[PDB]
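DATA SHEET
Item: assembly model
Revision: 1
Owner: S.N.
Input lines:
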Amino acid sequence: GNPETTTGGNALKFYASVRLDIRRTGAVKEGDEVVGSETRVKVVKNKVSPPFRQAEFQILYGKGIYRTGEII
DNA sequence: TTTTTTTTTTTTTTTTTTTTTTTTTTTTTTTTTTTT
């Protein structure tokens, strides 16, 4: 299976109406220096719509999440 | 024959019903082969 396991007991995954799984895949670079990181959010549970609808996006330091980058 | 008159005091306990929680990695090992 998957060795990784969250902390804080397992009384929270029953009540949690929706659980995300955020991971950092790559880093965005302006030539040589890094400005942001490539995040990959995966919905591992959901009580309001089908689960496992993993969605990827890029977040820039200071400027926040890159809404425009993913809209295009 | 007539002719009623006045209450007094507490004694005793009886029985338990129910579980609720995980949490943490740890470690490298060993070369092979001259070619003209």
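QC remark: The CA atoms of residues 20 and 43 of chain A lie 5 Å apart.
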